[PDB]
Coordinates of C-alpha atoms and ligand atoms in Angstrom, one line a residue:
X1 CA -4.2 35.3 -29.3
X2 CA -4.1 31.6 -28.4
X3 CA -3.0 30.5 -31.9
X4 CA 0.1 32.7 -31.5
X5 CA 1.3 31.8 -28.0
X6 CA 4.9 30.7 -27.9
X7 CA 4.0 27.1 -27.0
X8 CA 1.4 26.9 -29.7
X9 CA 4.0 28.1 -32.3
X10 CA 6.3 25.4 -30.9
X11 CA 3.6 22.8 -31.4
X12 CA 2.9 24.0 -34.9
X13 CA 6.6 23.3 -35.6
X14 CA 6.2 19.8 -34.1
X15 CA 3.4 19.0 -36.5
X16 CA 5.3 20.4 -39.5
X17 CA 8.3 18.4 -38.4
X18 CA 6.2 15.2 -38.3
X19 CA 5.0 16.0 -41.9
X20 CA 8.5 16.9 -43.3
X21 CA 9.7 13.7 -41.7
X22 CA 7.1 11.6 -43.3
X23 CA 7.8 13.2 -46.7
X24 CA 11.3 11.7 -46.6
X25 CA 9.8 8.2 -46.9
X26 CA 8.7 9.1 -50.4
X27 CA 12.4 9.3 -51.4
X28 CA 13.0 5.6 -51.0
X29 CA 11.7 2.7 -53.2
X30 CA 9.0 2.0 -54.2
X31 CA 8.2 5.7 -54.4
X32 CA 11.6 6.8 -55.7
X33 CA 10.9 10.5 -55.5
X34 CA 14.4 11.6 -54.7
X35 CA 13.5 15.3 -54.3
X36 CA 11.5 14.3 -51.2
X37 CA 14.8 13.7 -49.4
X38 CA 15.8 17.4 -50.0
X39 CA 12.4 18.5 -48.9
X40 CA 12.4 16.4 -45.7
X41 CA 15.9 17.6 -44.7
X42 CA 15.1 21.3 -45.5
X43 CA 12.3 21.2 -43.0
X44 CA 14.4 19.5 -40.3
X45 CA 17.1 22.3 -40.7
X46 CA 14.5 25.1 -41.1
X47 CA 12.2 24.1 -38.2
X48 CA 15.1 23.9 -35.7
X49 CA 16.3 27.4 -36.5
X50 CA 15.9 29.9 -33.6
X51 CA 15.0 27.3 -31.0
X52 CA 16.5 26.5 -27.6
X53 CA 18.1 23.1 -27.6
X54 CA 15.4 21.1 -25.9
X55 CA 12.8 22.7 -28.2
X56 CA 15.0 21.8 -31.2
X57 CA 15.5 18.3 -29.9
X58 CA 11.8 17.8 -29.7
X59 CA 11.5 19.0 -33.3
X60 CA 14.2 16.6 -34.3
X61 CA 12.4 13.8 -32.5
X62 CA 9.0 14.4 -34.2
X63 CA 10.8 14.8 -37.5
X64 CA 12.4 11.3 -37.0
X65 CA 9.1 10.0 -35.7
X66 CA 7.4 11.1 -39.0
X67 CA 10.2 9.5 -41.0
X68 CA 10.5 6.2 -39.1
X69 CA 6.8 6.1 -38.1
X70 CA 5.9 6.2 -41.8
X71 CA 8.9 4.4 -43.4
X72 CA 9.5 1.5 -41.0
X73 CA 6.0 0.5 -39.9
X74 CA 6.1 -2.3 -42.4
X75 CA 7.8 -4.3 -39.5
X76 CA 4.2 -4.5 -38.2
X77 CA 3.5 -7.1 -41.0
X78 CA 5.9 -9.5 -39.4
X79 CA 4.9 -8.8 -35.8
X80 CA 1.2 -9.3 -36.4
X81 CA 1.5 -12.5 -38.5
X82 CA 4.0 -14.4 -36.3
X83 CA 4.2 -12.5 -33.0
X84 CA 1.0 -13.9 -31.4
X85 CA 0.2 -10.6 -29.6
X86 CA -3.0 -8.5 -29.7
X87 CA -3.3 -5.8 -32.2
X88 CA -2.7 -2.9 -29.7
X89 CA 0.6 -4.4 -28.5
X90 CA 1.7 -4.8 -32.1
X91 CA 0.9 -1.2 -32.9
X92 CA 2.7 -0.1 -29.7
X93 CA 5.8 -2.0 -30.5
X94 CA 6.0 -0.3 -33.9
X95 CA 5.5 3.1 -32.3
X96 CA 8.1 2.1 -29.8
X97 CA 10.7 1.2 -32.4
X98 CA 10.1 4.5 -34.3
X99 CA 10.4 6.5 -31.1
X100 CA 13.7 4.8 -30.3
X101 CA 15.3 5.7 -33.7
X102 CA 13.8 9.2 -33.5
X103 CA 16.0 9.7 -30.4
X104 CA 19.0 10.0 -32.7
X105 CA 17.4 12.8 -34.9
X106 CA 16.4 14.5 -31.6
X107 CA 20.0 14.2 -30.4
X108 CA 21.1 15.7 -33.7
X109 CA 18.7 18.6 -33.4
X110 CA 19.4 19.3 -29.8
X111 CA 23.1 19.3 -30.2
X112 CA 23.1 21.3 -33.4
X113 CA 21.2 24.3 -31.9
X114 CA 23.0 24.1 -28.5
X115 CA 26.5 24.5 -30.1
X116 CA 25.4 26.5 -33.2
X117 CA 22.3 28.5 -32.1
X118 CA 22.7 31.2 -34.7
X119 CA 21.2 30.8 -38.2
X120 CA 24.6 30.6 -40.1
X121 CA 25.9 28.8 -43.2
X122 CA 28.4 27.3 -40.8
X123 CA 25.5 25.6 -38.9
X124 CA 23.7 24.3 -41.9
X125 CA 26.7 23.5 -44.3
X126 CA 29.6 22.6 -41.9
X127 CA 28.3 21.5 -38.5
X128 CA 25.1 19.9 -39.6
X129 CA 26.6 17.4 -42.1
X130 CA 29.4 16.5 -39.7
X131 CA 27.0 16.1 -36.8
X132 CA 24.5 14.2 -38.9
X133 CA 27.3 11.8 -39.8
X134 CA 27.9 11.2 -36.2
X135 CA 24.4 10.7 -34.9
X136 CA 23.6 8.4 -37.9
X137 CA 26.7 6.3 -37.1
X138 CA 25.3 5.9 -33.6
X139 CA 21.9 4.9 -34.9
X140 CA 23.6 2.1 -36.9
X141 CA 26.0 1.0 -34.1
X142 CA 24.2 1.2 -30.7
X143 CA 22.8 -2.3 -29.9
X144 CA 24.2 -3.6 -33.2
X145 CA 22.2 -0.8 -34.9
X146 CA 19.6 -0.2 -37.5
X147 CA 20.9 2.1 -40.2
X148 CA 17.6 2.0 -42.2
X149 CA 16.4 5.0 -44.2
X150 CA 19.5 6.9 -45.1
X151 CA 18.7 9.5 -47.7
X152 CA 21.8 8.7 -49.7
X153 CA 20.2 5.5 -50.9
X154 CA 17.5 7.6 -52.6
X155 CA 20.2 8.8 -55.1
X156 CA 20.8 5.4 -56.7
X157 CA 19.0 6.7 -59.8
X158 CA 19.7 10.4 -59.1
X159 CA 22.1 13.2 -59.9
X160 CA 24.5 12.3 -57.1
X161 CA 25.0 8.6 -57.7
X162 CA 28.5 9.2 -59.0
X163 CA 29.7 10.0 -55.5
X164 CA 29.0 6.5 -54.1
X165 CA 31.8 4.7 -56.0
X166 CA 34.2 7.4 -54.8
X167 CA 33.3 7.9 -51.1
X168 CA 30.3 5.5 -50.5
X169 CA 26.7 6.2 -49.8
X170 CA 27.4 8.1 -46.6
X171 CA 29.1 10.8 -48.7
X172 CA 25.7 11.2 -50.3
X173 CA 24.0 11.5 -46.9
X174 CA 26.7 14.2 -46.2
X175 CA 26.1 16.3 -49.3
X176 CA 22.3 16.1 -49.0
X177 CA 22.3 17.5 -45.5
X178 CA 24.6 20.3 -46.7
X179 CA 22.6 21.1 -49.8
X180 CA 19.3 20.9 -47.9
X181 CA 20.7 23.1 -45.1
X182 CA 21.7 25.8 -47.5
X183 CA 18.4 25.8 -49.3
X184 CA 16.6 26.1 -45.9
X185 CA 19.0 29.0 -45.0
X186 CA 18.3 30.8 -48.3
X187 CA 14.5 30.7 -47.7
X188 CA 14.2 31.8 -44.0
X189 CA 16.9 34.5 -44.6
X190 CA 15.3 35.2 -48.0
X191 CA 18.8 35.5 -49.6
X192 CA 19.9 34.2 -53.0
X193 CA 23.6 33.5 -52.2
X194 CA 23.1 30.2 -50.2
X195 CA 20.8 29.0 -53.0
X196 CA 23.4 29.4 -55.7
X197 CA 26.0 27.6 -53.6
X198 CA 23.6 24.8 -52.9
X199 CA 22.9 24.5 -56.6
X200 CA 26.6 24.4 -57.5
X201 CA 27.4 21.9 -54.7
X202 CA 24.5 19.7 -55.8
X203 CA 25.3 19.8 -59.6
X204 CA 29.1 19.5 -59.4
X205 CA 28.8 15.7 -58.8
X206 CA 26.6 15.2 -61.8
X207 CA 29.3 14.2 -64.4
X208 CA 30.7 11.6 -62.0
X209 CA 27.7 9.4 -62.7
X210 CA 29.4 8.7 -66.1
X211 CA 32.6 7.3 -64.7
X212 CA 33.1 3.5 -65.2
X213 CA 35.6 2.6 -62.5
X214 CA 35.6 -0.9 -63.8
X215 CA 36.3 -3.0 -66.9
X216 CA 33.9 -5.8 -68.1
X217 CA 35.4 -9.3 -68.3
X218 CA 33.5 -10.7 -71.4
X219 CA 35.6 -13.9 -71.5
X220 CA 34.1 -14.9 -68.1
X221 CA 30.5 -14.4 -69.0
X222 CA 28.1 -17.2 -67.9
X223 CA 24.5 -18.0 -67.6
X224 CA 23.3 -17.8 -64.0
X225 CA 19.9 -19.0 -62.7
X226 CA 18.2 -17.9 -59.5
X227 CA 15.3 -20.0 -58.3
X228 CA 12.6 -18.1 -56.5
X229 CA 10.8 -21.0 -54.8
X230 CA 8.1 -18.7 -53.2
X231 CA 7.8 -21.0 -50.1
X232 CA 5.3 -19.8 -47.4
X233 CA 6.4 -19.1 -43.9
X234 CA 8.7 -28.6 -38.0
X235 CA 7.3 -30.8 -40.8
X236 CA 9.6 -33.0 -42.9
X237 CA 6.7 -33.6 -45.3
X238 CA 6.9 -29.9 -46.2
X239 CA 10.7 -29.8 -46.3
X240 CA 10.6 -32.6 -48.9
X241 CA 8.1 -30.6 -51.0
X242 CA 10.5 -27.7 -50.8
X243 CA 13.5 -29.7 -52.0
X244 CA 11.2 -31.1 -54.7
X245 CA 10.4 -27.5 -55.9
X246 CA 14.1 -26.5 -55.9
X247 CA 15.5 -29.7 -57.4
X248 CA 12.8 -29.9 -60.1
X249 CA 13.4 -26.2 -61.1
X250 CA 17.2 -26.8 -61.0
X251 CA 17.5 -30.1 -62.9
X252 CA 16.7 -28.6 -66.4
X253 CA 19.3 -25.9 -65.8
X254 CA 22.3 -28.1 -65.1
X255 CA 24.6 -28.1 -68.1
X256 CA 23.2 -24.7 -69.2
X257 CA 23.6 -22.4 -66.2
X258 CA 27.2 -22.4 -64.8
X259 CA 25.8 -21.0 -61.6
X260 CA 22.5 -21.7 -59.8
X261 CA 21.4 -20.0 -56.7
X262 CA 18.8 -20.8 -54.1
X263 CA 17.8 -18.1 -51.5
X264 CA 18.3 -17.7 -47.8
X265 CA 17.6 -20.9 -45.8
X266 CA 16.2 -22.5 -49.0
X267 CA 17.0 -25.9 -47.5
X268 CA 14.9 -25.5 -44.3
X269 CA 16.7 -28.4 -42.5
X270 CA 20.0 -29.0 -40.8
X271 CA 23.0 -29.6 -43.1
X272 CA 23.9 -32.6 -40.9
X273 CA 20.5 -34.1 -41.7
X274 CA 20.8 -33.7 -45.5
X275 CA 24.1 -35.3 -46.4
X276 CA 22.6 -37.9 -48.8
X277 CA 20.6 -35.2 -50.7
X278 CA 23.5 -32.8 -50.8
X279 CA 26.0 -35.3 -52.0
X280 CA 23.7 -36.7 -54.7
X281 CA 22.9 -33.1 -55.9
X282 CA 26.7 -32.4 -55.8
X283 CA 27.3 -35.3 -58.2
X284 CA 24.6 -34.4 -60.6
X285 CA 25.8 -30.8 -60.7
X286 CA 29.4 -31.8 -61.2
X287 CA 28.6 -34.3 -64.0
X288 CA 27.0 -31.4 -66.0
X289 CA 29.5 -28.6 -65.3
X290 CA 27.1 -26.5 -63.2
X291 CA 27.5 -25.2 -59.6
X292 CA 24.9 -24.5 -57.0
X293 CA 25.0 -21.9 -54.2
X294 CA 22.3 -22.3 -51.6
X295 CA 21.2 -21.1 -48.2
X296 CA 20.9 -23.5 -45.3
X297 CA 20.9 -23.7 -41.5
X298 CA 24.1 -25.4 -40.2
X299 CA 24.1 -26.6 -36.6
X300 CA 27.8 -27.4 -36.3
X301 CA 29.2 -29.3 -33.3
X302 CA 32.2 -27.4 -31.8
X303 CA 35.2 -27.8 -29.6
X304 CA 33.0 -27.8 -26.5
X305 CA 30.6 -30.5 -27.9
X306 CA 27.8 -27.9 -28.2
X307 CA 26.1 -26.8 -31.4
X308 CA 26.7 -23.4 -33.0
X309 CA 23.7 -22.8 -35.2
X310 CA 24.6 -20.7 -38.2
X311 CA 22.7 -19.0 -41.1
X312 CA 24.8 -20.5 -43.8
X313 CA 25.6 -20.5 -47.5
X314 CA 27.0 -23.7 -49.0
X315 CA 28.4 -24.5 -52.4
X316 CA 28.2 -27.7 -54.6
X317 CA 29.2 -28.9 -58.0
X318 CA 31.9 -27.9 -60.4
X319 CA 34.6 -25.9 -58.8
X320 CA 33.0 -26.4 -55.4
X321 CA 32.8 -30.1 -54.5
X322 CA 30.4 -30.3 -51.6
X323 CA 31.7 -31.4 -48.2
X324 CA 30.6 -30.7 -44.7
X325 CA 34.2 -29.9 -44.0
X326 CA 34.6 -27.6 -46.9
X327 CA 35.6 -24.0 -46.2
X328 CA 33.9 -22.8 -49.4
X329 CA 31.0 -21.6 -47.2
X330 CA 29.7 -18.5 -45.5
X331 CA 28.1 -18.0 -42.0
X332 CA 26.0 -14.9 -41.4
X333 CA 27.8 -12.4 -39.2
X334 CA 25.3 -9.7 -38.4
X335 CA 22.1 -11.1 -37.0
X336 CA 18.8 -9.3 -37.5
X337 CA 17.8 -7.5 -34.3
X338 CA 14.6 -9.0 -32.9
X339 CA 14.5 -11.6 -35.7
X340 CA 17.5 -13.8 -35.0
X341 CA 18.4 -12.4 -31.6
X342 CA 17.1 -10.0 -29.0
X343 CA 19.5 -7.1 -28.1
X344 CA 20.8 -7.4 -24.6
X345 CA 19.6 -11.0 -24.3
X346 CA 23.1 -12.2 -23.1
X347 CA 23.1 -9.9 -20.1
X348 CA 19.5 -10.7 -18.9
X349 CA 19.7 -14.5 -19.7
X350 CA 20.6 -15.9 -16.2
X351 CA 17.3 -14.8 -14.8
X352 CA 15.1 -16.5 -17.5
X353 CA 13.3 -19.8 -16.8
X354 CA 15.0 -22.4 -19.0
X355 CA 11.6 -23.6 -20.4
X356 CA 10.9 -20.0 -21.7
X357 CA 14.3 -19.6 -23.5
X358 CA 14.3 -20.3 -27.3
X359 CA 15.3 -23.8 -28.2
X360 CA 18.4 -22.7 -30.2
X361 CA 20.4 -19.5 -30.4
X362 CA 22.0 -18.2 -33.6
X363 CA 25.8 -17.9 -33.6
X364 CA 27.7 -15.4 -35.7
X365 CA 30.3 -16.0 -38.3
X366 CA 33.5 -13.9 -38.5
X367 CA 33.3 -10.3 -39.6
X368 CA 35.6 -11.1 -42.6
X369 CA 35.3 -14.3 -44.5
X370 CA 36.8 -15.3 -47.9
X371 CA 34.8 -15.1 -51.1
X372 CA 32.8 -18.2 -52.0
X373 CA 34.1 -20.0 -55.1
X374 CA 31.8 -21.7 -57.6
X375 CA 32.8 -22.9 -61.1
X376 CA 35.8 -20.6 -60.8
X377 CA 33.7 -17.6 -59.9
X378 CA 34.5 -15.5 -56.8
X379 CA 31.4 -14.4 -54.9
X380 CA 31.5 -11.9 -52.0
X381 CA 28.6 -13.0 -49.9
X382 CA 26.2 -11.2 -47.6
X383 CA 23.0 -12.7 -46.2
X384 CA 19.8 -10.7 -46.1
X385 CA 20.1 -7.7 -43.7
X386 CA 23.9 -7.8 -44.2
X387 CA 23.7 -6.2 -47.6
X388 CA 22.8 -2.8 -46.1
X389 CA 26.1 -2.7 -44.2
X390 CA 28.2 -1.0 -46.7
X391 CA 31.5 -0.9 -44.8
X392 CA 31.2 -4.6 -43.9
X393 CA 30.5 -5.7 -47.5
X394 CA 33.5 -3.6 -48.6
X395 CA 35.8 -5.2 -46.1
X396 CA 34.8 -8.7 -47.3
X397 CA 35.2 -7.6 -50.9
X398 CA 38.5 -8.4 -52.6
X399 CA 40.0 -7.2 -55.9
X400 CA 39.4 -10.7 -57.4
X401 CA 35.7 -10.7 -56.4
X402 CA 33.7 -11.3 -59.6
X403 CA 30.1 -10.8 -58.2
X404 CA 28.5 -9.6 -55.0
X405 CA 26.1 -12.3 -53.7
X406 CA 23.1 -11.7 -51.5
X407 CA 20.5 -14.3 -50.6
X408 CA 17.5 -13.4 -48.4
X409 CA 13.9 -14.2 -47.6
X410 CA 11.7 -11.1 -47.2
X411 CA 8.4 -13.0 -47.1
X412 CA 8.0 -12.0 -43.5
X413 CA 6.9 -8.5 -44.6
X414 CA 4.5 -9.5 -47.5
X415 CA 3.3 -6.7 -49.8
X416 CA 4.8 -3.8 -47.9
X417 CA 7.5 -1.2 -48.8
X418 CA 10.1 -3.0 -46.6
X419 CA 11.4 -5.5 -49.3
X420 CA 11.6 -2.6 -51.8
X421 CA 13.7 -0.4 -49.4
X422 CA 15.9 -3.4 -48.7
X423 CA 16.3 -4.0 -52.5
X424 CA 17.1 -0.3 -52.9
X425 CA 20.1 -0.4 -50.5
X426 CA 21.3 -3.7 -52.0
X427 CA 21.8 -1.9 -55.3
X428 CA 24.0 0.7 -53.7
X429 CA 26.6 -2.0 -53.0
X430 CA 27.0 -2.9 -56.6
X431 CA 27.5 0.8 -57.4
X432 CA 29.9 1.3 -54.5
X433 CA 32.2 -1.6 -55.5
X434 CA 31.5 -1.7 -59.2
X435 CA 30.6 -5.3 -59.3
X436 CA 27.4 -7.0 -60.5
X437 CA 25.3 -8.2 -57.6
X438 CA 23.2 -11.4 -57.7
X439 CA 20.2 -11.1 -55.4
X440 CA 18.4 -14.4 -54.8
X441 CA 15.2 -14.3 -52.7
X442 CA 12.5 -16.6 -51.6
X443 CA 9.5 -14.6 -52.9
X444 CA 11.2 -11.4 -54.1
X445 CA 12.9 -9.2 -54.9
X446 CA 15.1 -11.4 -57.1
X447 CA 17.3 -9.5 -59.5
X448 CA 20.7 -9.0 -61.1
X449 CA 22.2 -5.6 -60.4
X450 CA 24.9 -4.3 -62.8
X451 CA 28.1 -2.6 -61.8
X452 CA 26.4 0.8 -61.7
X453 CA 23.4 -0.1 -59.6
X454 CA 21.2 -0.5 -62.7
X455 CA 18.6 -3.2 -62.6
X456 CA 19.8 -5.6 -65.3
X457 CA 17.3 -8.4 -64.7
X458 CA 14.5 -9.1 -62.3
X459 CA 11.5 -11.4 -61.8
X460 CA 8.3 -10.1 -60.1
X461 CA 7.5 -10.7 -56.4
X462 CA 5.2 -13.5 -55.2
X463 CA 6.0 -15.8 -58.0
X464 CA 7.5 -19.3 -58.2
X465 CA 9.9 -18.5 -61.0
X466 CA 13.5 -18.9 -62.2
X467 CA 15.5 -15.9 -63.2
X468 CA 17.8 -17.0 -66.0
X469 CA 20.1 -14.5 -67.7
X470 CA 23.7 -14.0 -68.8
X471 CA 25.9 -12.0 -66.5
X472 CA 29.4 -10.6 -67.1
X473 CA 32.0 -10.2 -64.2
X474 CA 33.9 -7.0 -63.8
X475 CA 37.4 -6.1 -62.5
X476 CA 38.8 -2.8 -61.2
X477 CA 38.8 -1.0 -57.9
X478 CA 36.6 2.0 -57.2
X479 CA 38.1 4.7 -55.0
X480 CA 35.7 3.7 -52.2
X481 CA 36.6 0.0 -52.6
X482 CA 40.3 1.0 -52.1
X483 CA 39.7 3.2 -49.0
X484 CA 36.4 2.5 -47.3
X485 CA 34.9 5.1 -44.9
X486 CA 38.0 6.9 -43.7
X487 CA 38.1 9.6 -46.3
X488 CA 34.7 10.8 -45.3
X489 CA 35.4 10.5 -41.6
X490 CA 38.4 12.8 -42.1
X491 CA 36.3 15.3 -44.0
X492 CA 33.8 14.9 -41.1
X493 CA 36.5 15.6 -38.6
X494 CA 37.8 18.6 -40.5
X495 CA 34.2 19.9 -40.7
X496 CA 33.5 18.9 -37.1
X497 CA 36.7 20.4 -35.7
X498 CA 36.4 23.7 -37.6
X499 CA 32.7 24.2 -36.6
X500 CA 33.1 23.5 -32.9
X501 CA 36.2 25.6 -32.6
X502 CA 34.4 28.6 -34.1
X503 CA 31.4 27.9 -31.8
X504 CA 34.0 28.2 -29.0
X505 CA 35.4 31.5 -30.3
Ligands
LH9_1 C1 -2.0 16.6 -42.0 C2 -2.1 16.2 -40.6 C3 -2.1 14.7 -40.4 C4 -1.5 14.2 -39.0 C5 -0.1 13.4 -39.0 C6 0.6 13.3 -40.4 C7 2.0 12.7 -40.4 C8 2.2 11.1 -40.4 C9 3.2 10.4 -39.8 C10 3.0 9.7 -38.4 C11 3.6 8.3 -38.2 C12 3.0 7.6 -37.0 C13 3.7 6.3 -36.5 C14 2.7 5.2 -35.9 C15 3.0 3.7 -36.3 C16 2.1 3.2 -37.5 C17 1.6 1.8 -37.1 O1 0.9 1.6 -36.2 O2 1.9 0.8 -38.0 C18 1.1 0.7 -39.2 C19 1.3 -0.7 -39.9 O3 0.4 -1.6 -39.2 C20 0.9 -0.6 -41.4 O4 1.6 -1.6 -42.0
LH9_2 C1 21.0 2.9 -25.7 C2 20.1 4.1 -26.0 C3 20.8 5.4 -26.4 C4 20.1 6.1 -27.6 C5 20.9 7.4 -28.1 C6 20.0 8.7 -27.9 C7 20.2 9.5 -26.6 C8 19.1 10.5 -26.3 C9 19.4 11.7 -25.9 C10 19.2 13.0 -26.8 C11 18.1 13.1 -27.9 C12 16.7 12.5 -27.5 C13 15.9 13.5 -26.6 C14 15.0 14.4 -27.3 C15 13.7 13.8 -27.8 C16 12.7 13.4 -26.7 C17 11.7 14.6 -26.5 O1 12.1 15.7 -26.2 O2 10.4 14.3 -26.8 C18 9.6 15.5 -27.1 C19 8.4 15.0 -28.0 O3 7.9 13.9 -27.4 C20 7.3 16.1 -28.0 O4 6.1 15.4 -28.2
LH9_3 C1 39.1 10.5 -57.8 C2 38.7 11.6 -56.8 C3 37.3 12.3 -57.1 C4 36.9 13.3 -56.0 C5 35.4 13.8 -56.0 C6 34.7 14.0 -54.6 C7 34.0 15.4 -54.4 C8 33.6 15.8 -52.9 C9 33.6 17.0 -52.3 C10 32.3 17.9 -52.0 C11 32.2 18.7 -50.7 C12 32.5 20.3 -50.8 C13 31.8 21.2 -49.7 C14 32.1 22.8 -49.7 C15 31.2 23.7 -48.8 C16 31.0 25.2 -49.2 C17 30.0 26.0 -48.2 O1 29.9 25.6 -47.1 O2 29.4 27.1 -48.7 C18 28.9 28.1 -47.8 C19 28.3 29.4 -48.5 O3 27.3 28.8 -49.3 C20 27.5 30.4 -47.5 O4 27.0 31.3 -48.4
LH9_4 C1 12.5 1.9 -23.7 C2 13.3 1.2 -24.8 C3 12.6 1.2 -26.2 C4 13.6 0.7 -27.3 C5 12.9 0.4 -28.7 C6 12.2 -1.0 -28.7 C7 12.3 -1.8 -30.1 C8 11.0 -2.6 -30.5 C9 10.8 -3.3 -31.6 C10 10.5 -4.8 -31.7 C11 9.6 -5.3 -32.8 C12 10.2 -5.5 -34.2 C13 10.2 -6.9 -34.8 C14 10.9 -7.1 -36.2 C15 10.9 -8.6 -36.7 C16 12.1 -9.0 -37.7 C17 11.7 -10.3 -38.4 O1 10.7 -10.5 -38.9 O2 12.7 -11.2 -38.4 C18 13.2 -11.6 -39.7 C19 14.4 -12.7 -39.6 O3 13.7 -13.9 -39.4 C20 15.1 -12.7 -41.0 O4 16.2 -13.7 -40.8
LH9_5 C1 13.4 -6.1 -25.0 C2 14.7 -5.7 -25.5 C3 14.9 -4.1 -25.7 C4 16.2 -3.8 -26.6 C5 16.3 -2.2 -26.9 C6 15.9 -1.9 -28.4 C7 17.0 -2.0 -29.5 C8 16.8 -1.4 -30.9 C9 17.6 -1.4 -32.0 C10 17.2 -2.1 -33.3 C11 15.8 -2.6 -33.6 C12 15.2 -2.5 -35.0 C13 15.3 -3.8 -35.9 C14 14.2 -4.1 -36.9 C15 14.4 -5.4 -37.7 C16 13.7 -5.4 -39.1 C17 14.7 -5.7 -40.2 O1 15.6 -5.0 -40.5 O2 14.5 -6.9 -41.0 C18 14.5 -6.7 -42.4 C19 15.2 -7.9 -43.1 O3 16.5 -7.7 -43.1 C20 14.9 -9.2 -42.3 O4 15.2 -10.3 -43.1
LH9_6 C1 5.2 25.4 -43.9 C2 5.0 24.9 -45.3 C3 3.9 23.9 -45.5 C4 4.2 22.5 -44.8 C5 3.7 21.3 -45.6 C6 4.5 20.0 -45.4 C7 5.1 19.4 -46.7 C8 5.9 18.2 -46.6 C9 5.5 16.9 -46.3 C10 4.4 16.1 -47.0 C11 3.3 15.4 -46.2 C12 3.0 13.9 -46.6 C13 3.5 12.9 -45.6 C14 3.1 11.4 -45.8 C15 3.7 10.8 -47.2 C16 3.2 9.4 -47.5 C17 4.1 8.3 -47.0 O1 5.1 8.6 -46.4 O2 3.8 7.0 -47.2 C18 4.2 6.0 -46.3 C19 3.2 4.9 -46.1 O3 3.6 3.9 -47.0 C20 3.3 4.3 -44.6 O4 3.8 3.0 -44.8

């Protein structure tokens, strides 16, 4: 009898949930098995059927734990290499992070069955997508958020990619949970009608993939070069060898590439301390008709005679004469949680011994900043983690933007799937805004993404290489570039409002 007790059957559901959760990791790069997203969501919606809320919440937690425990544990690579803590602590911190994010899938499951206990199409097709949209927003907002592993991104090369330029990637998250909900409903109820509807709703967006919301601008085509210095991890001697690598790789490209790009924090020294190098390089670039965009750390003295330390992008050369007082620059807005700041650190700071506090704290640039301009080219900039924040990138985008720009350094996570998941989401921005995206990294993944998310050029990871190719700007506004998120939030409110009112009836 034991195998069939009520608690054992609940536990079986918890194990299955863990498995279905882990299957969802296969949807994202480098695995790119986009059907695994539909499989993972079908289990989440099937295993929560006919459960009390706290049971369902536990199922949603274990589902998320399988998803995040298997799709985010690459953060271990950075913790174990630079954290200085024993192995067990490092494992525990990774488990901790996955348990934290699993709270939001648990919240989704608990709320879904509490308000929509019955196995309906309303539950799986109306309430679930609406509620999923809410709990996923909270995951990406609370404590500055971590909106990593959103199944919509797995459709970058899939049947539903045509929806992203219209309503953004969250619209794909929305439809996937609806389509997966109906498939789950068809199987447990062994009924063909929800299957047909799921197939229609899933296939209707297919032709949209062929819409080109943009027009190429051939007369503005240029040769761009992206230097992948592949620099490992307080030594001037090594900074000089870093400028040597970048200068020597860049010098033969001046006069040939109109735009040259070094990655995040390529110049591993304060801008204040490199005026002679930067002015000399400015002159050489200007005298050959080339421009350089580069990452750097800028400790800027402020009104209060203190230093705001920014993660910065500077410009030099033709159409961007370098100057410490230039406004042709970009300061990272969204810092990496636990990388560039610790959440809640401002509140709990007065109690910390001064000697234990970090030497410097990173400051944040404004949420909206103008495009960078180099050699007459408009570049909407995002640094590293910022490229995953679709709404933010779209609010900095302007109709005159020629290319999206992202520079980053993903060496912290070595050979793991992290950099690939990051690269995957970056491509969704190019598709959302119908602009080519230039992605310059330290040791990968360095690539040019076309206006429909396609990989147009790329150099392999872990190589000291220059990616040189011709790139063409685009003009035109996708429906999502014009609107942003609010169309889907209306649809989410319509769905949410209609579902909860019927649950009250
Ligand atoms: C068929 C039955 C098999 C039983 C369970 C199957 C489901 C698996 C998902 C479970 C995910 C667990 C999360 C723990 C964190 C991993 C970690 O410690 O980090 C590793 C990192 O060091 C490597 O980079
Ligand atoms: C600032 C932080 C706020 C974060 C927002 C989320 C709020 C949480 C409440 C609701 C959802 C989480 C509770 C259910 C999961 C825990 C559980 O039942 O575990 C069972 C499992 O362990 C069996 O093994
Ligand atoms: C330029 C503008 C282009 C605009 C294109 C965007 C398209 C987005 C809309 C897609 C969402 C439709 C969802 C309908 C739900 C039907 C349902 O719940 O069925 C239940 C039944 O199956 C139970 O048996
Ligand atoms: C009861 C409350 C429990 C709440 C959950 C606890 C969360 C634990 C996770 C902390 C460990 C993750 C460290 C990631 C390092 C990022 C990095 O490498 O930085 C890159 C940066 O340098 C690029 O600029
Ligand atoms: C003791 C304080 C307790 C505070 C409560 C826990 C808060 C949890 C929320 C968010 C934590 C997850 C962030 C992981 C960062 C890895 C990443 O994304 O880096 C990739 C690349 O972009 C870097 O270059
Ligand atoms: C009731 C019907 C039968 C139920 C069977 C369940 C079927 C679905 C799930 C598939 C199980 C595989 C989960 C792990 C996938 C590998 C992965 O995620 O690799 C991440 C790795 O890289 C860690 O970093």
